[PDB]
Design a binder for this molecule. Sequence first.
Ligand SMILES: C=C(C)[C@]12C[C@@H](C)[C@@]34O[C@](Cc5ccccc5)(O[C@@H]1[C@@H]3C=C(COC(=O)Cc1ccc(O)c(OC)c1)C[C@]1(O)C(=O)C(C)=C[C@@H]41)O2
Ligand code: NA
Lengths: 70, 199, 536
Amino acid sequence: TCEKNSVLEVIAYSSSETPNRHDMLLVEPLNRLLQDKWDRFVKRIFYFNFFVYCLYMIIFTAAAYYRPVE
Amino acid sequence: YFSQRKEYVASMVFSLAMGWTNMLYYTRGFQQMGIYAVMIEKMILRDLCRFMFVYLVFLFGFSTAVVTLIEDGKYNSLYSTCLELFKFTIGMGDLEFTENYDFKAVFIILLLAYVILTYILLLNMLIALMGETVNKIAQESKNIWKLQRAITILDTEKSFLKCMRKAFRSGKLLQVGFTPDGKDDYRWCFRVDEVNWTT
Amino acid sequence: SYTDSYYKGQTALHIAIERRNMTLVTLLVENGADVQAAANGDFFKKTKGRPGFYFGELPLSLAACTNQLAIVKFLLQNSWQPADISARDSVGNTVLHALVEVADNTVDNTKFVTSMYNEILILGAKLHPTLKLEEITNRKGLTPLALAASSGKIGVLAYILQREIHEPECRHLSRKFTEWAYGPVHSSLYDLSCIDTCEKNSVLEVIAYSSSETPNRHDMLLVEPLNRLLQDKWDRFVKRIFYFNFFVYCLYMIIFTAAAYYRPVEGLPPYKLKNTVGDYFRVTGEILSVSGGVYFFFRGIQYFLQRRPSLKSLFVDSYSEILFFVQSLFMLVSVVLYFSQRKEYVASMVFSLAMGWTNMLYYTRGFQQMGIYAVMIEKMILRDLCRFMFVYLVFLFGFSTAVVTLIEDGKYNSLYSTCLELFKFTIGMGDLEFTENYDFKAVFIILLLAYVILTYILLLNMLIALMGETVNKIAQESKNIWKLQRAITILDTEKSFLKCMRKAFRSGKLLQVGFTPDGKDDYRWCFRVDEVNWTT
Ligand SMILES: C=C(C)[C@]12C[C@@H](C)[C@@]34O[C@](Cc5ccccc5)(O[C@@H]1[C@@H]3C=C(COC(=O)Cc1ccc(O)c(OC)c1)C[C@]1(O)C(=O)C(C)=C[C@@H]41)O2
Ligand code: NA
């Protein structure tokens, strides 16, 4: 919580030119923060979104397959 | 679809293919399975993108040579000729030399030169480079995976689509409580336990 | 003390020992502190999903884990309140089990853990000559040697199996005993107790039947007594039995093959026997084939009941047993359909026959040269194809449904032929005959060429590079893998043996010391080993 620009946003949304983009997340407070957030609520939401996307694709597939030929 | 054109089918079909292929986005963030997604991304963005120009140079040069040589046969059109030569590159040719046109030997020399140049030399060069890319990051998954996970977390926090912002980790705890003035600090401190077996 | 869920049982004595304050320990013990109290908080217990300091919950083990020899000497030897050197925690671990537990196979760890272990043993023998701490088993039924073998504590095994004490009145604790030495060569006797004949849980059982997560599972068989013991066991009797079993299996497969080939072509089984030689030999082959299937079936059930493997390691270990069991299942299903008046038994029989030959590769395990290929195929099937299946199926299903959406009444317009045809395109055995009359031809060509490029060029070579990485990653590991397979084969041959005899002792019932603390003399089934070292 920064209200202007937090550390995690800066690391994550970096431009991929930063030399140590991967190692910055190994610093212990950040690693524990990400693990806690993952286990706490994010993991379930991610799985839920994956499931919903799968249902969306199944419906799209079934709808397209039975298109009319007139 | 609403413009009264059959061609909507074509657009729909392409979307459907992407609709399944983009499912691989959800393999990102698994320690085992995100490696395939990132390998595909790196390979498509670097290696095929660069190699496209070399292969297109060879394809166009030999294609225009062949179209110039042949006078009214099956090859004498750039579309079919380019298709056939592309099939030759991936090892899907015929090489049936039982035709009745003049300059047969020149056609054979050109086509065999193309086959050796594309099927044996260039494609294997490409495959060696792609294998180098694949093995370069096979060990890097432990580094890569966390980063992917990190991005997801911020997005799931960023939108969150319920108006709640319970993004804090622990209580509004007091660290010191004695600033240089008479006030006291509470800083949302987060507790961490760590282990080190040294000495 | 602390009465919470986390620090439960911690008292001032634990704190003083943890702080390395000998004075506070001495004063607290002098003041009537309990030196045998159990610290059983969640912080102080063995656990996976929380940090902690497991040490065995006792002050004596706390000093022992922390490398404070003076404190353990005081706690055992003080008259104010002596400690019980054989005290057991809630897990049943003693000080020795705690010492083994806190090892991690590093140099300084190995040094001080080995030293403290030795000192505890010497103090126990001198103070309590009738007490044998190493015979004490924890709640899992493990002695400290069994615990060390289970956890992969290579350094602790290297110490224990080759332990020699050059001090009188405690030589009976030694396991290695040196008989003679020449310039480069010397011969010693090794105790060998509870290496192979234990009746509860031997070292070789624990090494062989470990769950493959133990980091040093391969190196533990290189510790010298085990290496020579297994080599002699191989050369003595196991080698001939293994070759005999391989030969018998070959005969079984030949008979099954011949019987399957000459099946009758009439409908509606079962088929009646005619008074002719062909029918007699055919039904003989059928009976032997079904007999072998039943044999493998019951062996598989016995294996699963004896091991009780978990799901997550069900295929990582027990691969060959699973495949033999699946073969036997196909044989039984073939029998059931045969007597159910169905032709479809042929189909089941065919699958079993194919597996029947392929599982022959199990017998290449245990050769230095040919064993490498079976394990390479095992790793490549379990690791690489299983993961890559989902990616390839995503591509296959996406493009297949795209194509079947596009085509109106052609050869393509059905997912079965389209999936087959696109699979042929994946392995580079398509046709690409674009001389048809369907509309949207250009869109179709774009889609199919995109699929062909994506699968045949990009994905398949990614798979092949990863498989090559797997292949070379274990090409140099052939020695270790061969050793482990050899050990498993030896133990399996010793277990069953089909004659009720177990004359698998390595050497005679020899005497090592013969001078116990009491007036008895000990014989311990010692094992003579001669070794050569050109150092200096
Ligand atoms: C139950 C499993 C795991 C399994 C059973 C069958 C279907 C199997 O395909 C797999 C999946 C498969 C199918 C096709 C191509 C690749 C993988 O792998 C084995 C299984 C795998 C094989 C390949 O054989 C090997 O790995 C050789 C081998 C390696 C190590 C061993 O210890 C061993 O001794 C038993 C044999 C043989 C088959 O059983 C067979 O003969 C047929 C027709 C298919 C193979 O499914
Ligand atoms: Na080919």
